[PDB]
Amino acid sequence: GANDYVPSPITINTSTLPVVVITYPRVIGELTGTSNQYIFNGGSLIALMRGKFTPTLPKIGKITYNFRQGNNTQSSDFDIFDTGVPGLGIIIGMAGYWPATPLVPINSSSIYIDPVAANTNPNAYNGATGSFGARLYVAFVATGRLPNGYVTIPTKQLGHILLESNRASLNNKRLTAPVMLNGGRIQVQS
Ligand SMILES: OC[C@H]1O[C@H](O)[C@H](O)[C@@H](O)[C@H]1O
Ligand SMILES: [Cl-]
Ligand SMILES: [Cl-]
Ligand SMILES: [Cl-]
Ligand SMILES: [Cl-]
Ligand SMILES: [Cl-]
Ligand SMILES: [Cl-]
C-alpha closest to that of 79 among 103, 67, 98, 63? 63
Q: How far apart are the first and last CA of the chain?
A: 56
**Count of C-beta atoms within a 10 Å radius of residue 31:** 22
For 34-44, b where at least 16 C-beta lie within 10 A, e where not — what string? bbbebbbbebe
Written in H, E and C, the secondary structure of the chain is CCCCCEECCEEEEHHHCCCEECCCCEEEEECCCEEEEEEEECCCCCECEEEEEEECCCEEEEEEECCCCCCCCCCEEEEEEECCCCCEEEEEEEEECCCCCCCEECCCCCEEEECHHHHCCCCCCCCCECEEEEEEEEEEEECCCCCCEEEEECCEEEEEEEEEECCHHHHCCCCEEEEEEECEEEEEEC
- The answer to whether 160 and 176 have CB atoms below 8 angstroms apart is yes
- If you take atom 3 of ligand 1, which residue's CA is the nearest one? 131
For residue 83, what are the contacts with CB-CB under 8 A and spacing of at least 6? Answer: 57, 89, 90, 140, 153, 154, 156, 181
Query: According to the annotation, is 133 in a ligand binding site?
Result: yes
- The answer to whether 77 and 105 have CB atoms below 8 angstroms apart is yes
The residue ranges of every structural domain in the chain are: 1-190
Residue 73 half-sphere exposure, CB side, CA atoms within 13 Å?
0
* Displacement of CA 37 from its chain's centroid (Å): 14
Give the mutation target among 49, 97, 136 for probing the ligand 1 site: most ligand atoms within 8 A of CB: 97
**Count of C-beta atoms within a 10 Å radius of residue 80:** 24
Query: According to the annotation, is 98 in a ligand binding site?
Result: yes
Closest ligand 1 atom to 41 CA: 6
Kindly provide the resolution of this structure in angstroms, with one decimal.
1.7
Burial class (CB in 10 A: 0-12, 13-18, 19+), 122: exposed
Alpha-carbon span 58 to 79, nearest angstrom: 10
Alpha-carbon span 72 to 104, nearest angstrom: 9
* Displacement of CA 125 from its chain's centroid (Å): 19
Alpha-carbon span 47 to 132, nearest angstrom: 10
Give the mutation target among 35, 48, 131 for probing the ligand 1 site: most ligand atoms within 8 A of CB: 131
- The answer to whether 116 and 103 have CB atoms below 8 angstroms apart is no
Report CA-CA distances (Å) from 106 to 1, 28, 55, 58, 153.
Answer: 34, 18, 8, 13, 21
Breaks (C–N over 2.5 Å) after residues, the chain:
22
Query: According to the annotation, is 127 in a ligand binding site?
Result: no
- Cβ < 6 Å from ligand 1: which residues? 37, 97, 126, 129, 131-133
Residue 34 half-sphere exposure, CB side, CA atoms within 13 Å?
19
